[PDB]
Amino acid sequence: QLQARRLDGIDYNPWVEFVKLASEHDVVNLGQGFPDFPPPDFAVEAFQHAVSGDFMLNQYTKTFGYPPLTKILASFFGELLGQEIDPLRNVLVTVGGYGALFTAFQALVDEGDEVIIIEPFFDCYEPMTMMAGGRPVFVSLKPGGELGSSSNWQLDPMELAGKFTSRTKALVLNTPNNPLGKVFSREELELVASLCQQHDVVCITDEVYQWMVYDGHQHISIASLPGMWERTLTIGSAGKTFSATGWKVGWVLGPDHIMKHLRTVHQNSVFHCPTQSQAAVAESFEREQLLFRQPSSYFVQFPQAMQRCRDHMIRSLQSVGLKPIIPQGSYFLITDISDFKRKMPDLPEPYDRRFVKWMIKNKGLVAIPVSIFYSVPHQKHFDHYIRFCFVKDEATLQAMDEKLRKWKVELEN
Amino acid sequence: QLQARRLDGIDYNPWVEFVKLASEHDVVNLGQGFPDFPPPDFAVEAFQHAVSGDFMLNQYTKTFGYPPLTKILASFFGELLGQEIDPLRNVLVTVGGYGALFTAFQALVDEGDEVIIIEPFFDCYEPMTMMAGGRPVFVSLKPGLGSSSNWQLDPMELAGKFTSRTKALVLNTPNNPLGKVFSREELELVASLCQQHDVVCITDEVYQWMVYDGHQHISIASLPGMWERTLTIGSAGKTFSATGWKVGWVLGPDHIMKHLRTVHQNSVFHCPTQSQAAVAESFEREQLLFRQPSSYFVQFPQAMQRCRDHMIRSLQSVGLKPIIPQGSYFLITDISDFKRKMPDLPGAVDEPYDRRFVKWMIKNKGLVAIPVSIFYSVPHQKHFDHYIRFCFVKDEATLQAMDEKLRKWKVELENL
Numbered sequence: 001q002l003q004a005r006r007l008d009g010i011d012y013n014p015w016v017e018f019v020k021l022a023s024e025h026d027v028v029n030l031g032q033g034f035p036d037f038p039p040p041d042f043a044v045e046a047f048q049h050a051v052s053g054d055f056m057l058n059q060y061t062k063t064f065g066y067p068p069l070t071k072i073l074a075s076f077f078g079e080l081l082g083q084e085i086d087p088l089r090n091v092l093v094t095v096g097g098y099g100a101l102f103t104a105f106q107a108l109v110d111e112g113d114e115v116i117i118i119e120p121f122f123d124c125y126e127p128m129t130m131m132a133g134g135r136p137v138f139v140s141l142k143p144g145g146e147l148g149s150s151s152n153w154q155l156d157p158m159e160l161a162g163k164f165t166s167r168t169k170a171l172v173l174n175t176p177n178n179p180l181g182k183v184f185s186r187e188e189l190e191l192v193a194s195l196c197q198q199h200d201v202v203c204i205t206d207e208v209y210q211w212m213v214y215d216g217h218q219h220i221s222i223a224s225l226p227g228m229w230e231r232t233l234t235i236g237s238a239g240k241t242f243s244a245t246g247w248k249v250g251w252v253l254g255p256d257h258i259m260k261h262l263r264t265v266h267q268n269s270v271f272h273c274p275t276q277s278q279a280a281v282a283e284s285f286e287r288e289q290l291l292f293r294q295p296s297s298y299f300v301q302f303p304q305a306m307q308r309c310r311d312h313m314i315r316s317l318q319s320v321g322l323k324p325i326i327p328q329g330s331y332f333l334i335t336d337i338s339d340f341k342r343k344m345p346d347l348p349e350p351y352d353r354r355f356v357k358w359m360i361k362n363k364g365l366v367a368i369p370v371s372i373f374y375s376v377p378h379q380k381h382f383d384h385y386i387r388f389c390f391v392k393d394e395a396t397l398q399a400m401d402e403k404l405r406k407w408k409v410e411l412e413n
Numbered sequence: 414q415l416q417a418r419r420l421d422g423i424d425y426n427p428w429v430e431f432v433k434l435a436s437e438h439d440v441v442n443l444g445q446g447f448p449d450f451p452p453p454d455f456a457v458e459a460f461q462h463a464v465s466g467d468f469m470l471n472q473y474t475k476t477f478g479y480p481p482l483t484k485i486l487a488s489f490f491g492e493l494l495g496q497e498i499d500p501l502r503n504v505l506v507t508v509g510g511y512g513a514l515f516t517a518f519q520a521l522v523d524e525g526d527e528v529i530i531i532e533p534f535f536d537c538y539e540p541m542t543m544m545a546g547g548r549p550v551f552v553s554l555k556p557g558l559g560s561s562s563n564w565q566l567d568p569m570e571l572a573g574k575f576t577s578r579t580k581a582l583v584l585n586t587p588n589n590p591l592g593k594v595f596s597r598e599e600l601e602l603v604a605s606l607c608q609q610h611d612v613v614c615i616t617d618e619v620y621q622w623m624v625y626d627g628h629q630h631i632s633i634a635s636l637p638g639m640w641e642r643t644l645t646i647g648s649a650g651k652t653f654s655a656t657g658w659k660v661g662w663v664l665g666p667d668h669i670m671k672h673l674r675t676v677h678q679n680s681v682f683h684c685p686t687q688s689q690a691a692v693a694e695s696f697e698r699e700q701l702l703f704r705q706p707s708s709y710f711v712q713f714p715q716a717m718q719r720c721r722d723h724m725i726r727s728l729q730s731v732g733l734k735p736i737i738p739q740g741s742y743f744l745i746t747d748i749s750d751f752k753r754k755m756p757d758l759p760g761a762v763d764e765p766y767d768r769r770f771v772k773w774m775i776k777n778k779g780l781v782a783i784p785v786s787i788f789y790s791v792p793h794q795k796h797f798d799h800y801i802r803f804c805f806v807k808d809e810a811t812l813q814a815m816d817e818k819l820r821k822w823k824v825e826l827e828n829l
Contacts, residue, residue, distance in 0.1 A: 003672045
């Protein structure tokens, strides 16, 4: 005792141990999920205009979000979703997409409620479900020349339909997917959409990477699917949108009859979000609406630039025998290390975690074992994947190449 | 169904309903709890250095707080508390003191746990306790021009509230709304009662720099053997008059802090990097200029003490009897004279008087105050319906506009 019950089990964070080993050794870091280059000019300038503009911006703003920010969000994503969005009832600014999730979990998930989670998942889905008193129900994506694609990682309609029960309160969908990089097709979404409707289940859709799409694929918001607006909470992140993760500004879009409860959580937790950062994000969105689908917009330019970095890393990793799975989205790609697993199983606990450590110590490269994105039971079978982030400065990628090339020489001498 | 159980009852917010009325009418707003003047130059400049400095500040910082910020917090309040503070185990940067409170409640308060709360309280204490599954135990301050100092805490009644279910006691000093600064006698009473019943003490000290009339803020965490049981909360917004920054922190022992860290990384994980760097920079200057006449921690309370004294005499001229605060942004006034000479005020049945009065004052006099009723538990609202709260931390222009409104009221009182 002398502590809360909801903190049971959820106290351990696997992310940290790797950060500890990484600092100790000289390494090229590809495990970090943030860009190591500056945000675009208009984004940085917008923040400078907020701190050097009206002095009244240094004080409290309205509780459910800076009104200019809520307005642009409503009108911009309104068009995109093809939906009438009321900036008061349908929008809520949160402390990043992380806070957005938390707000949603606390508002809807109760004691003994079930939450369907798709593996591999953004790891925080499980603790947040547990802390909310609910119990996570996991459904697994099945993995699919020499290279794999994130598109052929299938969602078996059987196993999914079987997981739905009368206790199922919510389904958490993350697209584009972290860590896999999978972008969900209309077929897959309509499957989820119809199952949620049939079982009367709320769908929390994590779309923080909706702008990071490659190879002509387009992001499809499940909230725009027929009759799904009534049941979905759409989450986005300003940090991942404008490559400014240290801003920690997020938002949730949904119907009033659901949003009202998230508002309750909000004003009984943080009440306010920082005023200036909201104004910066508000300004940045105004420009992107003005330049929408135009070749000089950041939403067109940045994914193309990052797709180039994606393509780079994929071939670079191939040169050492790692088999990457080509992502259609997100900041990340994962690589299969099965070949390393059989040719080198004697590593000094799921295998990929041992592999990453060995790679940090001996090769000077940092990746993330996908094990931590899987539920503890399923960690036995999916112990042979690791995650790289290709959203890095070109210098970082060049440093990676040198390390990768020394790896050849290490094997060749 | 289709919603969580913890959101029961806590869905209604009394603050909002007044803002609706205030917005529609032409009024001088003294109900707002934020300064309507800019933050000090060094504070604003510090924020500009963060957004125009290293580009790496635009990205994630360490999960439990920006390392330079945690360090200065540790060394600065370390000296103040007279305690060795480890920036890793003893410090946690949160989304303002509001987030700080929330983190503490979620970490410690469980199902059926009791939380001792002192009336009048910062209203959010009751919902946060309820949502955490705990049930609030209220103890009332008794009134003795009036002073916030003689609002006494009965040692008999207080000791009676402590049970084996009592998990935590929430102490707010300097107090919102009352403005009371707790004496060493009162703190030692609380301290010994908490120790004897093995109870954690969450102390809200966001106004610790706002102290007047030569009174000093005493942190209960510095009392002998209290560091082991206390979580100390502060806010950068209230500290540097920059409420829109929403940066806060909690200081305590590791064996308690570890659980707040669990809550933190399973909720928001990160706090904004740049705002933290600004607060870190602002604190560095104030440590450098500590107790010196050119520091903000010396100048600002002095400047605000005048605004207090100003408002106190201005409100008297209309028959309002203020209770002189020793701290915080606020003073409350007794409206009992208005209550007997004018009880016929319109409103819903079983609606406390000060709420009817504040409405009446906005509509007819063009002044905004806050009914203290919302700082009391619903049962106790029957007895404490005759106080309203003013915020005197305003620009001099706002105070002048207040005087003009008050003088029209006076002339109104000098004829009709």
